[PDB]
Structure formats: C-alpha cells, structure tokens
Amino acid sequence: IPTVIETTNRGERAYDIYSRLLKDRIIMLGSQIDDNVANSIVSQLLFLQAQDSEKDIYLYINSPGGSVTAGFAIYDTIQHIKPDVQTICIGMAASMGSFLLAAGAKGKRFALPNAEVMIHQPLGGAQGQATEIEIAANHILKTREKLNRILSERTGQSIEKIQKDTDRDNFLTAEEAKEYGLIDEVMVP
Amino acid sequence: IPTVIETTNRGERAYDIYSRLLKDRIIMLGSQIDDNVANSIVSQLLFLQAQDSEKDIYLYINSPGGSVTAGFAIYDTIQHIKPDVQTICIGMAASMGSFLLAAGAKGKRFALPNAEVMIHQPLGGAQGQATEIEIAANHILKTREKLNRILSERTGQSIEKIQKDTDRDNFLTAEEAKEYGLIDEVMVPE
Amino acid sequence: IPTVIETTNRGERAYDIYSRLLKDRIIMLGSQIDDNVANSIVSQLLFLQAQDSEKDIYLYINSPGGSVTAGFAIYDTIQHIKPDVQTICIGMAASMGSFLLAAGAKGKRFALPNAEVMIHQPLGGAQGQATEIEIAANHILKTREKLNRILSERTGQSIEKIQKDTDRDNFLTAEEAKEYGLIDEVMVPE
Amino acid sequence: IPTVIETTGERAYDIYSRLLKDRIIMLGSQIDDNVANSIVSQLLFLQAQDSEKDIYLYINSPGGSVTAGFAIYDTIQHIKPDVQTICIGMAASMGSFLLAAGAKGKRFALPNAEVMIHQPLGGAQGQATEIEIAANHILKTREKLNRILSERTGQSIEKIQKDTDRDNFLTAEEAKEYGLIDEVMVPE
Amino acid sequence: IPTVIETTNRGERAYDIYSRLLKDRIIMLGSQIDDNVANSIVSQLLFLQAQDSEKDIYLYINSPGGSVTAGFAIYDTIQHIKPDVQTICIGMAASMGSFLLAAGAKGKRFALPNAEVMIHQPLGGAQGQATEIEIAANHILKTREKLNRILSERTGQSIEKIQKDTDRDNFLTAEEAKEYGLIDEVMVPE
Amino acid sequence: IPTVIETTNRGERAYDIYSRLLKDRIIMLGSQIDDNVANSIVSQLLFLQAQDSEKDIYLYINSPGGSVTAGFAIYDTIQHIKPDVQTICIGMAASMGSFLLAAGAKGKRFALPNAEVMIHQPLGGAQGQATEIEIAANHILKTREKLNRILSERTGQSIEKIQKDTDRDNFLTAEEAKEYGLIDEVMVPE
Amino acid sequence: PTVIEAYDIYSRLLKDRIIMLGSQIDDNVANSIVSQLLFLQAQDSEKDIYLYINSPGGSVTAGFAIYDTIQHIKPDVQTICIGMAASMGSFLLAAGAKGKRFALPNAEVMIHQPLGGAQGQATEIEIAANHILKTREKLNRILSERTGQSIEKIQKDTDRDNFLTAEEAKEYGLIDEVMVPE
Amino acid sequence: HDDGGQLTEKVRRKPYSVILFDEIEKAHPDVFNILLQVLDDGHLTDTKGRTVDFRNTIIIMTSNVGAQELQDQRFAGFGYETIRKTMLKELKNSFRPEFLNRVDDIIVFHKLTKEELKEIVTMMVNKLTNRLSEQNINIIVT
Numbered sequence A: 001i002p003t004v005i006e007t008t009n010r011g012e013r014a015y016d017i018y019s020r021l022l023k024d025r026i027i028m029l030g031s032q033i034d035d036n037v038a039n040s041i042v043s044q045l046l047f048l049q050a051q052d053s054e055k056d057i058y059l060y061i062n063s064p065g066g067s068v069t070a071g072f073a074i075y076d077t078i079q080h081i082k083p084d085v086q087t088i089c090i091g092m093a094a095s096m097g098s099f100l101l102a103a104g105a106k107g108k109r110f111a112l113p114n115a116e117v118m119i120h121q122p123l124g125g126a127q128g129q130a131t132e133i134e135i136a137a138n139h140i141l142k143t144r145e146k147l148n149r150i151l152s153e154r155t156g157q158s159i160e161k162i163q164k165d166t167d168r169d170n171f172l173t174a175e176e177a178k179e180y181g182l183i184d185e186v187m188v189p
Numbered sequence B, C, E, F: 001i002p003t004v005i006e007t008t009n010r011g012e013r014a015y016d017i018y019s020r021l022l023k024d025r026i027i028m029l030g031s032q033i034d035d036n037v038a039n040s041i042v043s044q045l046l047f048l049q050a051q052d053s054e055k056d057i058y059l060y061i062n063s064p065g066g067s068v069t070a071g072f073a074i075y076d077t078i079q080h081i082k083p084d085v086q087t088i089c090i091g092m093a094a095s096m097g098s099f100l101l102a103a104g105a106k107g108k109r110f111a112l113p114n115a116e117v118m119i120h121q122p123l124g125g126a127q128g129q130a131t132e133i134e135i136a137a138n139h140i141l142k143t144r145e146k147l148n149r150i151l152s153e154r155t156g157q158s159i160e161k162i163q164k165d166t167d168r169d170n171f172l173t174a175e176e177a178k179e180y181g182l183i184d185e186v187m188v189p190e
Numbered sequence D: 001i002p003t004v005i006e007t008t009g010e011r012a013y014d015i016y017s018r019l020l021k022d023r024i025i026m027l028g029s030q031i032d033d034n035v036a037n038s039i040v041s042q043l044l045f046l047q048a049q050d051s052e053k054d055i056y057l058y059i060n061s062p063g064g065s066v067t068a069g070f071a072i073y074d075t076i077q078h079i080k081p082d083v084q085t086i087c088i089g090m091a092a093s094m095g096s097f098l099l100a101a102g103a104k105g106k107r108f109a110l111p112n113a114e115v116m117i118h119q120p121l122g123g124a125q126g127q128a129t130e131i132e133i134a135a136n137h138i139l140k141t142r143e144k145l146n147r148i149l150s151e152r153t154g155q156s157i158e159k160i161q162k163d164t165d166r167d168n169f170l171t172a173e174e175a176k177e178y179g180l181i182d183e184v185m186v187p188e
Numbered sequence G: 001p002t003v004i005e006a007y008d009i010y011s012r013l014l015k016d017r018i019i020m021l022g023s024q025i026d027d028n029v030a031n032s033i034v035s036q037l038l039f040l041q042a043q044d045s046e047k048d049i050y051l052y053i054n055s056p057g058g059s060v061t062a063g064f065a066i067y068d069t070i071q072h073i074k075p076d077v078q079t080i081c082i083g084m085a086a087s088m089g090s091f092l093l094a095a096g097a098k099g100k101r102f103a104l105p106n107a108e109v110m111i112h113q114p115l116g117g118a119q120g121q122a123t124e125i126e127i128a129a130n131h132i133l134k135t136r137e138k139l140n141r142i143l144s145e146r147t148g149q150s151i152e153k154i155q156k157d158t159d160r161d162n163f164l165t166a167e168e169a170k171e172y173g174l175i176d177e178v179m180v181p182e
Numbered sequence H: 001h002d003d004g005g006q007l008t009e010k011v012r013r014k015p016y017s018v019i020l021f022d023e024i025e026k027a028h029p030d031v032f033n034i035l036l037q038v039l040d041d042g043h044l045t046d047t048k049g050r051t052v053d054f055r056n057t058i059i060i061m062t063s064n065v066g067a068q069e070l071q072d073q074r075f076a077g078f079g080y081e082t083i084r085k086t087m088l089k090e091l092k093n094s095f096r097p098e099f100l101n102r103v104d105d106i107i108v109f110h111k112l113t114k115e116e117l118k119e120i121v122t123m124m125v126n127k128l129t130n131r132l133s134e135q136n137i138n139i140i141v142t
Ligand SMILES: [Mg+2]
Pocket: H040
C-alpha cells in the first residue's frame, strides 16, 4: 500500500491511500465483515459525523459478507448519524455486504456497471444438546426475520418475495439489483 | 486501521482512529476480553479520570465475551473512578460483554435499535484428581454467585430469576434488554 | 523495499519506491489479483484522477491472474475515471491479468517484445446439493459469457472466436496478442 | 494499544508510558524472564528518577516463573522507595507472592478481585539421581516461598504449608484476613 | 540491515545500505527471482530511468534464478530503458540469474574472480488431461527456444551449441564464462 | 517495552528502557545466550569501552544458559576491554550464565539475596560415524576442560573439586555462591 | 539497543568501520556484508576495515562473494575471530589482510570440506559431485595460498572436522597473532 | 533603538501609501499579530512610543498556494465555487480567526485561462512595440 504525502505551510501529512481517501469522506469496506472491521467502520462513521455533520459520506463496498452482528453494528451506525451515506458497490456485495449496500441513503445507492451483488439467508451452526440446538436454531431464524424485514422496508419488495428469493444463493447483475431495489441506479461512466 | 489528521491552532497532529476517539473520551471494547485487553481498558479509564474527574466517559461495547477475571477488572475500575461511565452496545454484548454493559452508570446505559445482548452462566473447566475437580467446581460456582448477585443488584431483577434465565444461552433484543433492565433506553436515530 | 529520498524544493521527504512511482502516475501490479490488491489499485486510480484529471496513467501489469470480481472492480474503475490508462504487459498477463491488459485505453495498450499473455475460461468450483451445483454452474457460465462479451467488444474479435480460443489455455506472444487485438503495439526498444 | 496526547507538554505517549510517568508499573501478563527483566529495569529507572516518591505495581497475572518472581521481589526489596501493590483482577501463584511483597499498609485489592495461592509447579525427567536433584531443588524453592510468605503475612509457616497444598482461591476480604493485603480499597 | 548516515549541503540524511547503494544507481538482485522481486527490480529501473536518462545503471546479481516470466520481465525492462545497465555477478548467477547477467550492455558485463555462473534449460510442470500436458509441453519448449535465441544473439554462440550445452546443469568459472561470452571481462582486483 | 521520558532538566529525550540503562552503562543480559545476543553484548561492551575507557561497566545477568561459544565470546570481550565489568546476578545464572557471573572483576561480583546460580558440565551431541562421534566427544571434553580451568582460575577452587561438583546439576544459593567464590558478596538491602 | 549520540548499535559500530558477521552466511547476509564493504570503501579509500567474525558456517557461494569483495576493495580488511569461525567462517578469517588476522584468546576455529547433496539420475549425481569436488579444489587452493600450508596437508586436515584453538590456529597460519588483553 | 521601525518610519513619512505584505504564509504566523491593531484601529505604536497612523493606507497581503498544494485539495472519488470554498477553508487553518476577521475582503485569484494568457501576450507585446516604436523600430507579431 503506497503512501501519499501532502506538503503544506504547517508541515507534512503522510497518508496511506485509504487514509487519503478518508480525507475526502470515503470509507472503504473491502474485506470480510468481522468485529475488528466493524469497529473500524463505526469509528470512522462517528469521526466523519463529527468532522462535518452535514456533508454526505461515501461507503465503498467490495466484501464477501461476514458476521451478521458486525453488519448490524455498521447498519445502526449508518442509520444513527445525521449525514446521508452513499453506498457504491465496487466489485462484489455478498451476504451482509449487499445488506449494507441496500442500507445507503435513499437515492444514493449505486453499483458500478458490472459489479455483482448476491443475497442469501444467513449461515450459522449449532452443536448441542437438543435444547441448545433448539436455542441456536431459534436465534438464527429470528436473525433471518430481522434481515428479511429490513430488506423489505428498504427495497420495497414484499417480505414473502425476499423469503423466497433469499432461500438459495441468488446472484444479481447491477441492472437486476436496480430493479430489485437494492440500488438506485447504475453509475454510467 | 486508518489515520486521521486534524488541524488545530496549536499545530497539526496525526491520530489513529481509536486514539482520536479516545481524545473525545470514547473507549472501544471491540474484542474478546482477555488479560491484556482489560489491562488496556483499565489504563485508558485511569488516564481519562486523571485528565478530567467530572466529564463522562463512554464505553463502546462490541465483544463476544471473555475471561471473567478481566471482566471484573474492568467492572471494578468502572466502579472506582469518579466519572460516570456511559455504556453503549454497538453489535453484540455477550457474557462479560453484557455484564460490562449493565455495569454502566444508571440512566446512561444504551443499545442501538437492533443490537443484541446475550447472558449465560460462565464457562470453565476442571481436570485431574477428584479433589482438584471439586475445588475448580466450587470456584466456578462462587464466580456464578458473584455474577448473579451483581446483575440482580444492577438490573433490579430477582436473583432467582437471573439464576433461572442464565441457565442456557439467552439472546435478547434491545427492547427485551431494556425491559429486563440491562439497558436504560434504546438509542433513537436522528 | 528501498527508500528514495528524492524530493523537490525542501528535498526533505522520502518515499518507498512504489509511492515515488505513484507520484509519476505509475501504478504497479505485480501480483495475483486478490480483493485487497484490487482495492488498493482502485484507490490509487481514484487518487490519480483527483490529482490531475487529464494526464495519462501508466498501469504496468504482470499478474498471473486472480479473482474475477477484483478484476472487474479494476476494469470498472478504469472505465469510470477520466484519464486514459496505458496498460503495459511486462512479463506475463494471464487470466484476469490479460483482461486488464485489454481494458487499457484504445491505442495505448502495450507489451514489451517478449512478454507472454494467456487467455482461458475462468476457473471455479461448486460443492453440495444438485440444486447448489446447478446454481454455481449457471453463475460461472454467465460470468464466462460476460468476460467473452467484454473481450469481444475490446478486441473486436467475434464472440464465437473468443469462445473457441479460450477453451484451453492459449499462450500468445506479444506479436500474436497484437494480431488478436488485445494490445495495440509492441514497445520495440530505443 | 492507543496513543495519548497530554496538552500541557503537548507530548505524545502510549498509555503504559503515560502510566509509567506517574510511577505506575503495570504487570498484566504471565511472569517470564523478559517481563521480569523489564519490570526490574522500570523499577531501577523509577528509583533513579526520584528516590523517595512511592512506586505503584498493578498486578493482573496468572503467575509465572518463580525465578523471575524472586528477581522482581529482590528488586522491590533493594530499592528505597515503597512499592505499592494493587491487585486489579487476578493475582495467582507468584502474582499473589508479588502482591504480598508490597510495602506494609500499601497493599490493596479491588472489591472483588480474587487472589490464589498454591505450591509451585515443576518437572523432573531422566535418571533417578537427576529426578532426586530436581525434587530437592523444587522443595527448597517451596521452602523459600513459604518462609517469605510467613514473614510477610505473619501467618505461621505450617498454616501456609497446609493451605497451599491444593489450589486455594481467596476473595479480597479473605485475602485481607489472611494478611496478603492490608485493605480492600473502597470506591467513592 | 544496518543504517548509514551521511552529511549533505542541505542537511543530514540517514539511509539503509540498499537505499544508499540506490542513491548511486546500484541495484541489488540478491534473492530468488519471483514476481515480487521482479516487481521491485522493474520499479527501481523505471525510477532510475526517470531520475536521469543517461547515467549508467549497475545491477549486482547474486541469485539462484527463479521464475522465467519474472526474469523476462526484468530483461525486457533492462532493454527498454534508455540508460545502459552494467551487470556484475557477485557470487552466483544460476538459471535466469545468468540470463540476466548476459542481459547487460555490451562490454559492461563483469564477474568477480571466482564467482560461478550456471546455465540450464528451464524447469516447469504439467498436470491434468493429455491435451493440457501437450499444451504445457509446447509452452515450455517455446520458452526454451526463446531463451536459446536470446542467448545466441547476446553471446554470439550458435543456437545448437547452447541447445547442447544447456541440456544438463553446466557450471562455469568466471574465466570460462568470459570464454563462453556470457561476461566480457573479469573484474581484475586492485 | 515501555518508553521513558528523561533528562527532566530539559525533558526533551524519550528513551527506551534498555537504552536508558545503557546510558548508565548498564548492559542487560536477560535471555538465553544464543549468538546474536552474544554479538549484541559484545557490541555494547565495545561501545561502552570506546565511550569511556575508565568508568566501570555493569553486566546484569538473568539467563538459563546458552551456547558455550557465545559465552566465551562475551568472556573474552570482558577480559579484553580496559574497564572493570561488574557482574550482578538478578534472578538466575545457569550454565554459561554462572560462568559469566564469575567472569566479572574480582571484588565487583554480586547476587541478589535469594537469586540462584547453577553449574553443570556442558551439554552437547554427536551423531554419525564412530570417528565423528570420537571427534565430537573429544571437542566437548576439551571444552569442559577449558570451562573447568577458567573457573578454577577465577574462583580459586581446586580444579578436581570443580570437576566433581559439576558432575550433576548443582544448585547454589547466593550464600553458597559466595562460599564457592563465584560471587564476592550478597547485595544487602538498605 | 539504541545508542544516543541516535543509532542502533551496529550502525554506530559501522560508523567506526566495524562490520559484524555474527550469523549464518546464507545469502542476504553476504549481500549485506558486500554492500557494507562497498560503502566503507567509498567512505574512505585507505583507512582499515575491521571484520568481526562469529559465524558457524554458511553457503560457499556467499563466502566466496565476501572473499572476492575483500580482495577487490582498496583498504586492508582486518579479521577478528570473536568466538567461532567454522566452514566459510574460518575461510573468511584466513582471508584477512596479512598481519591483521586475529583471534580472541579462547575463540575456536574449525575447518572441514564443504557439505553438499545430489539426487536423481546417475548423470546428475555425477555432475553435482564433480562440481562439489572442483569447489573443494578452489577452497583448498585458496587456503594453501593464504596460510602457506601445503595443499596436501590441508587436503588431509580438512578431511574430518578439525577443531583448532587460537594458538593452534596461529601455528597453522589461519591467524597472525592472538589478541593479548590489556 | 535610536532607529525607528522601518515600516513605521516609512509610513510616517508617506501616510498616503500602499503597503504590500508579500507571501504572508512564509512569514512566522505570530508576526501578523502586530497588524491586528493596525487593521482594527489604524494605529501602530513605534517602540519610542510614537503613534503612527495608518488610517489613510491600503494594506495588501498576497499568499501563494502552490500547484501541489491546490492539487491536494481536490476531491478523490466517483463523480470555481468548490475551489474557492476549499481554498478559503484551508486558509482558515493557517491564520487566527481574530486576524481574518479584521480583513475587509479576502479574494481568490483564479488560475489563468488560455485566452487570458493570449491577452497577456497581447499586452506585453503591445508595450514592447510602443517602446521600440519610439525608437522608430516598427514591429508586429502574427
Ligand atoms: Mg475589531
């Protein structure tokens, strides 16, 4: 990762390329969502809200998904802060990645012309005594209820249509994602 | 972990994002609670008390749990210092995570609208002779007694109810946590 | 990685070789295209678009291949930014590597006199139930069709010719890559 | 590990170096040779920096090497400053030993820290004579530990012998009654 | 890696030994050639060609060889840039190492008095169906043809003599390397 | 390893704890003597000797032993330099640790009140042909002869007693180390 | 360890023209040593250079790269065996400038024929064996030149592992004198 | 001390004058603290205790933003007012707010356009042709 140095009257700022992008209120989500990544993303969102409470923030997405809990942390932070968050799918938005893609500000959700998005029901696992299998299954089902409900509220699609379509792995082009309501338009060059 | 540059009258300084949040008295608990994490959290709390003894401190919790000993280290530091510690659950508060969530100052414990909290009895283990297994079991039981007692004192829920409800893994929504008294109110978006 | 101290006016700064080359708008792709490589390349392209919107960019390619998704992220960023990107194949471009070589601006795609290029259908895999293998096969086939469509547009070869030519590994010399239409000329030395 | 900025200098520190500026030494990990070496170097530096202000040793460790524990102990005894010890979470094995090693009246535990004491662990392998030698050495190490604890709690050496036979977990109140700590420090 | 300090009219600069050598346009190729090493070497050559287009560049070679593709990337970069590249074998130049030793400018190729150089046909591999093994074998054979051609052009030895003499491993002393035409003179010590 | 703020007549310099102790001329030997540790100790001794030829040096020993060759390198350097080297056993000096402890300047060798020292014959190994085993055994035996001789010449203890007391792992308290002549006196606390 | 005047210890010693060879002579080590020797030649063409040797061995190629650099540069390179010189370690000790090769009083040196290996077809084993023999020829010849010992005596003494004390190394002519303390 | 301030003396001898402070960002930031009283009240006290009145002067402060400096201010991302806004915001990071608040107007000079360069060449050539013409050298440039 190369370093950018900006020379000023006061001194020298050295940025990694992601820190240089953050200067312009760009946040990069470019890896699997785990707790470390989500904590970084949340702290960046809060910082950008502080730095200026009224300018848009751009969240670039290129993630294979990840932990649902960490993606809800990012979602709730995006929903809390005053600035609108623009979400741009750079290359892939899979699982929670596509959930966060749909979480952008209304009218400010984008995909590049042939970046792909994918939606599926959440993965999980259990190993158990029968009561603990039951508990884990009920928790995972409630998590799917949450995700389906939020997607229905943000795509406008019916909750039955999402329950059906997310059953197996479902791949969508940028145009299919647009007519599915996950994104608002395709970024023409 | 990206770097922030902030320009100020006194000059211009670089911060990692977590140190920039720490300047606003925000502490991030983002990881499994182990000895070195809790030691770091204790040191941050002590420094924030030294810097100003009356401004609130905000503890941001996104942890799967961890060592009960380190959790009590953080709890006792939160109780000893004079500032109110606000606790905000971001993603998950589980095990000692939700314990430290309930440890926040009364009226200043929050969760985001669809955070989740989970409570259960402590995990452990014992190996060796019968007397060693007895000793380890007695210690784990007394630890559960401490945890139940503290939670019943801070939720106001009866100690028998917390003993019953922590028997298996118990996942709670933000509203369920508020009605259970683990949090004071759910944060509302603005 | 050797550090260069060369700097103007003050002359006080120092850069690793890659950041110094980034100052000359040189972007260097010498590895397999994984997600974080591509994400770095994309951020560098956006930076170079900001730094000057009309000076050309030089993209030196030597990737053995990589993730198709990451290659399309780079391809779409190259297509979106305003500067022309010169693509220069140094040793081998293969798989998505040669796709990114084709992605360069019309008339500014180059190879050195004895670089290789290779083109082939994308690799993949599937496991599990019949339904899931069907779904993965359909996805991989549609991805192949997308790649062959883009190659047919940029090369000007017919889609059926690329379909036949990409079935096995197809190593091409620089001259054969120019004749095919992946590159525009061979950079004969001074 | 976060970086701290303190405005009056406008100087940058990392949190442990900031604590060390206030003469706070943190022992947060298993005691090994390089950890104890670092703690010795910190104690010597703090003695040189000012010979009369107290030093604070905060302890949250599961134990470790007995030899490194005696290195720390003998350093705490050599220097003139009083070394305060505060058990933050767990003080087990040499951790509770170093906890007891603090200056009388300046040993504290948080209200629900837990401290644990036991006979040391070791191991012996090879010929009968080498096993005998290792057993004798471990027994003399236990004798040293028992003696020092008797001299620093006031508890009889036979009571220490009895109570350390198995693992023994003491709450902070029980640890005060045992005399390992002088009081359980109280919040505002 | 030790640090050098040096005083200069503008001020005082600290360097690591390879960056101090790079200040004098000395490139060190002291490791197995792979895509990351080729990436580094090409980046340095491009930087040096931008820094000054006329002064010689010195490539010190001490490598057991490596990937053929990365070696050709270095070779083609050396031929494409305008500055002359001197090559000095410091101890061993095997496989692509000796090839890159032959790549230096006419009259500016050297070896230390008892360094060794080794030449042999490239290693490769083939796996899968008969058709894929056929395609791999054809590719490796054309790579051998290409290497033999370049070596014959640059040493003046016949293509048949190189084809025979590279069949097995072939160890040459510096004097034998000069006789073969790989280097132009041995560095007489003084 | 913590950072230290020092020279509080100015408060400018931040030191790292071992560099601060080296400013005192305190060399720390806190790990198994391997080779790079010994090299670092030799370099520190030679620096302290060049920095001032007359002030004593202090070597702090806390080590379980190590490579015998490296210990002899430290020994020979301590003998070569002009300053007296004081040796202080902080926690343990075993094998080559206790050797270097005895190697200090006579009258300036100390142990902490309940530090422990241990002496034993050198460990080694031999594998292969009978003649190679013979050669290795002879070399190891002559190394033991060297260690025995130097120990006798620096403790004053008769060589046949050292030859007998090093037969097995011999653990000595600080008092017994003083009576064995290894240390000169036990450091008494204020 | 940081020395303040601030420097890492080896760079401070390098500013005194001390070079440290305290590890396995693999390849990156030798490359770093060659680069240090060249920088010291450019720093001053005539002051001595001091090479401190403590290496258990290494690659013969890297040893010859160091040797040829020591022979090429204009300064005299002093060599001191600080603890052990073995395989190419002792070869480079012998390679010092005549009259400036030293050992500490109870450092040890070891000399032996080079190790190698071969695998596969008979012809390839033959080729590798011939190469290894020619390399032993080179090492023997250079040792006979720089010690003055007869090449057959070296051929016999290096057949097995041959440990030598500092005194024995002086009598063998691997070193010129043992450093007396002061 | 028996000599005045150079600025104060020059203004005292020529009270109707234009004062140019040139490349202000290169000066030490605290040197401007002197001008605070000059811009709020038009009075500067010489060290002798002599009040010099600036009330009839025009005070101009030029500041340079280099090519790199103003390149670094551009937004990086997908897809003159923004230049002025960012340049002024960056100026606020270099000077005290109580200093800029004194200033009557802060003006941004735009990078010269191509036809502006053509008009500049026209004007410089016109001046040269006039100066040569009075030497009876008639000249014209295509
Ligand atoms: Mg005013």
